[PDB]
Each structure stands twice: as structure tokens, then as C-alpha cells.
């Protein structure tokens, strides 16, 4: 059983078990998106991204990187899977941060996102 | 010795060992001969011996029904085998594969999907 086993792992907070279940499933499955949502809720960006890419849903795999503020992975996946819509995301996020006078945070994101010039 | 509670158990053990080793034809032959020896004396044959003989004979008939191209009969027999595939340890992977193919030919595609999903266990 897969659908209930993922729920048991989640309620037990055995996220290693969830990761093992997600990597033991076939390439596509009705359960992998749910596992990735669970990972996103708990905050495991890497496992959620791998699960979504297994589902073949790169759009969500980058939306979670944006949501979890892992901009390096977001830009890398945009370069790979050809979205290229995250440049504006970074630009306006850093603009908002500067509006809050948190220039250091803007520098930190620009370093994370490899926008080293900015 | 006419202690027929132990003759059936010995027959089951021998047939199961030969089945596990991978010689299903020899296991079926020996189990059938032993079953006929027990039957010839008008003795109540235990249900375990009959079940083992039925499973072995179903697997034996798989080859015959596939041989003549009758995909429905062979597919039904392969479903019966796959439901007990643990009784065929040394050929768990091959037989199951055949089942899917047969279940694809006979139109039992739901069974094919279920068996292939069971194949994709790690």
C-alpha cells in the first residue's frame, strides 16, 4: 500500500521514510505530487523538488524554490527547463527588500541566485 | 505402514522442495504419482495435497495453452499461478512477466496492469 503508507510516514514525522517511499515509486504515480506537497509543508525543499521533477512538474518544482526562497535552484531549473520567468521574481523581491532597507538581504539573494553583478 | 497422515505430509514436502528448486515438471510428476498412489486405496486426500497438485498442474497447463496460441486459457492459468507466485520462488520474475504479456494478448489488461505494478516493486 502506497497511499496510506505515505500518510503514516507523514503523521509519524518519519520524513526519511517518506523520501525512501518517494524514491521507490515508479517514474510517474498518483502519489508523488502528494508526497511533494507534504515535503513543501514540512519545508524540505530538496526532496520536494526531486519529487516534483519525478512527477514531471517542473513548474511547481520552481514555484516551491521561489516559495521556500531557494533562488539558486529556481534559477538553475529555469535555465534547464526553459521557464526564464524568475528574473523578474528576483528583481522585484530584491526591490521590496531594498524598500525595507535590507540591502544585506538583497546581496544575500543575489549571491544565492548567482546574480553576482547586482 | 498404513499411516496415511504422514505419507501425505512427505508427499507435500517432496513436491514443495522440487517446486522450489525450479523443476515444476518433475514436481508435478512425482506429486501426481503420489496422489494416485494415495487415491488407489480410497483414502481421503488432504486438501493441501490437492491444492499443490492443482497449482502445479495449472502451471504445467500454462505451457500447453501458450504453445497452441490459445491466449485466454493460458492467461487464466497464468493468473492462477501469479496469485500463488510465492509457490514458484526461483521463477518469480520470469513467469510474472509472461503473465503480463499473456494478459495483454488475451485482453485481460486490468490483470496485466496489476501484475506489472506488482513487478515494479524494488
Provide CB contacts within 8 A for B108, sequence distance 6+: B75, B76, B79, B102
For chain B, what's the residue count? 122
Q: Which three cell numbers stand for residue A37?
A: 506537497
Q: Residue length, chain A?
A: 118
CA–CA gap between residue B29 and residue B79 (Å, rounded): 22
Q: What is the Cα–Cα distance from A103 to A95, expressed in whole angstroms?
A: 9
DSSP for residue B108: -
B64, B32, B88, B25: CA torsion to nearest 10: -50
Exposed, middle or buried: residue A63 (CB in 10 Å: 0-12, 13-18, 19+)?
middle
What's B91's DSSP letter?
G
Determine contact, residues B103/B111, Cβ cutoff 8 Å. yes
Q: Which of A28, A33, A37, A38 is nearest to A8 (CA)?
A: A38
Place of cell 534547464: A80
Residues contacting residue B85 through CB under 8 Å, at least 6 positions apart: B92, B95, B96
Q: Angle at Cα A45 formed by Cα A44 and Cα A46, nearest 5°? A: 95
- Within B1-122, residue ranges assigned H as helices are 4-21, 24-39, 47-67, 71-82, 92-105, 109-119
Output the CA torsion sign for A46, A49, A51, A54: negative
Q: Cα–Cα distance between A116 and A112 in angstroms, integer?
A: 9
> Shortest CA distance to A67 belongs to which of A59, A57, A79?
A59
- In three-state form (DSSP H/G/I as H, E/B as E, the rest C), the secondary structure along chain A is CCHHHHHHHHHHCCHHHHHHHHHHCCCCCCCHHHHHHHHHHHCCHHHHHHHHHHHCCHHHHHHHHHHCCCHHHHHHHHHHHCCCCHHHHHHHHHHHHHHCCCHHHHHHHHHHCCCCCC
Query: What's the rounded Cα separation, in Å, for the pair B38 and A109?
Result: 82
Question: Quick one: CA dihedral A37, A42, A46, A51, positive or negative?
Answer: negative
Place of cell 531594498: A98
> Are the C-beta atoms of residues B14 and B44 closer than 8 Å to each other?
no
Q: Is residue B117 helix, strand or coil?
A: helix
Whether residue B52 contacts residue B35, with contact meaning beta carbons closer than 8 Å, is answered with: no
Contacts with B122 (C-beta within 8 Å, 6 or more apart), sequence order? A24
Measure the CA–CA gap between B82 and B65, rounded to whole angstroms.
16
**Nearest 5°: phi and psi at A84?**
60, 20
SS3 B100: helix
Amino acid at each position: 500500500n502506497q497511499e496510506r503508507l505515505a500518510e503514516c510516514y507523514y503523521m509519524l514525522e518519519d520524513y526519511e521514510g517518506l523520501e525512501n517511499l518517494a524514491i521507490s515509486l515508479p517514474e510517474n504515480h498518483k502519489l508523488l505530487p502528494e508526497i511533494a506537497q507534504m515535503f513543501v509543508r514540512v519545508g524540505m525543499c530538496e526532496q520536494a523538488v526531486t519529487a516534483f521533477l519525478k512527477c514531471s512538474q517542473p513548474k511547481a518544482a520552481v514555484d516551491t524554490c521561489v516559495h521556500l526562497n531557494q533562488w539558486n535552484k529556481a534559477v538553475e531549473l529555469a535555465k534547464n527547463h526553459s521557464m526564464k520567468e524568475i528574473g523578474s521574481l528576483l528583481a522585484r523581491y530584491a526591490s521590496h527588500l531594498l524598500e525595507k532597507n535590507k540591502t544585506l538581504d538583497a546581496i544575500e539573494l543575489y549571491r544565492k541566485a548567482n546574480y553576482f553583478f547586482d | 505402514l498404513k499411516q496415511y497422515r504422514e505419507a501425505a505430509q512427505t508427499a507435500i514436502i517432496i513436491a514443495r522442495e522440487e517446486q522450489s528448486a525450479g523443476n515444476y515438471r518433475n514436481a508435478h510428476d512425482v506429486l501426481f504419482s503420489m496422489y494416485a498412489e494415495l487415491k488407489s486405496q480410497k483414502i481421503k486426500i488432504p486438501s493441501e495435497m490437492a491444492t499443490n497438485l492443482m497449482i502445479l498442474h495449472s502451471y504445467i497447463l500454462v505451457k500447453i495453452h501458450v504453445k497452441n496460441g490459445d491466449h485466454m486459457k493460458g492467461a487464466r492459468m497464468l493468473i492462477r499461478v501469479a496469485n500463488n507466485i510465492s509457490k514458484f520462488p526461483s521463477h518469480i520474475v520470469p513467469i510474472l512477466t509472461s503473465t503480463v504479456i499473456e494478459c495483454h494478448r488475451a485482453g485481460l489488461k486490468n490483470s496485466a496492469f496489476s501484475f506489472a505494478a506488482m513487478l515494479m516493486r524494488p
